[PDB]
Amino acid sequence: SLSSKDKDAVKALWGKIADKAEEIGADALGRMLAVYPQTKTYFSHWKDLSPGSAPVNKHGKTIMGGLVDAVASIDDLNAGLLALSELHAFTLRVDPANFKILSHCILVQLAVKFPKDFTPEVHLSYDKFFSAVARALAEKYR
């Protein structure tokens, strides 16, 4: 469960990254596809999976849109992300191992661009946030 401290720190980071948010998502995705090629299968119906392609760029915006919704719904992630849960956990049957993969790639990208934001304590809140997003997204599995 996210504390008030964790929510402040998440919202803060989210304000820092707005200008780059679209780009953060696009590259994080390129990291996931290259570094964890077990995930490629979920997106092979696109036209191109390369780090800078039109489909990766477009989907990276969409991921960051969903995380923005998460930030909006931070007080109740389970209720707030339910349509995305139905999509990921029921319709697409995304293996839950994959959610932590994406989260990690997002943190890696955020760290490469925002090194000073990543104190242990801040990273703890970010991790709790991404863990809670994944639990929210897992609601509709079963």
């Binding site: 596809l33 570094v35 890696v108 990208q109 490469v112 242990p120 304590e121 990273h123 703890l124």
Partner: protein
């Protein structure tokens, strides 16, 4: 495992760029703070009451250096990592009973510490080579059933 030239040279390059004591200490601190159940494995390593306590713990700085030098050992034995780690595997599994998911947690903390230091140079292809290396390392540290 079979290394391409890029993988082999990326790995050597990354470590050549790391301060083992600085990166080691940050990495282990990061893991005990972000994933606090990992503290239990380090019960006789001084005060771990809180973030700032882990951060100023001389023993956690010392052991982070040890981990990094342990990793450097694999970098020096890239085509014999399993055998190189056979004794470490037995310690971490048979004596210490470290749940294997903790190896991945520590690995992830290291990557993020490395990411924050190298910045844009720590690319997807570079993280790819680094993850492959950590995967091999983690696999060699886990229990050997074969």
């Amino acid at each position: 495992v079979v290394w391409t030239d890029f993988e082999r040279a990326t790995i050597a390059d990354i470590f050549s760029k790391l301060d083992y004591e600085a990166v080691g200490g940050a990495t282990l601190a990061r893991c005990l703070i972000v994933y606090p159940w990992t503290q239990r494995y380090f019960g006789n390593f001084g005060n771990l009451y809180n973030a700032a306590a882990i951060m100023g713990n001389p023993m956690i700085a010392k052991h982070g250096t040890t981990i990094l030098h342990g990793l450097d050992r694999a970098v020096k034995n890239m085509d014999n990592i399993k055998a190189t780690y056979a004794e470490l595997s037995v310690l971490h599994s048979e004596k210490l009973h470290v749940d294997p998911d903790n190896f991945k947690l520590l690995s992830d903390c290291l990557t993020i510490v490395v990411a924050a230091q190298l910045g844009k140079a720590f690319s997807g292809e570079v993280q790819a080579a680094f993850q492959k290396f950590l995967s091999v390392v983690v696999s060699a540290l886990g229990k050997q059933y074969h």
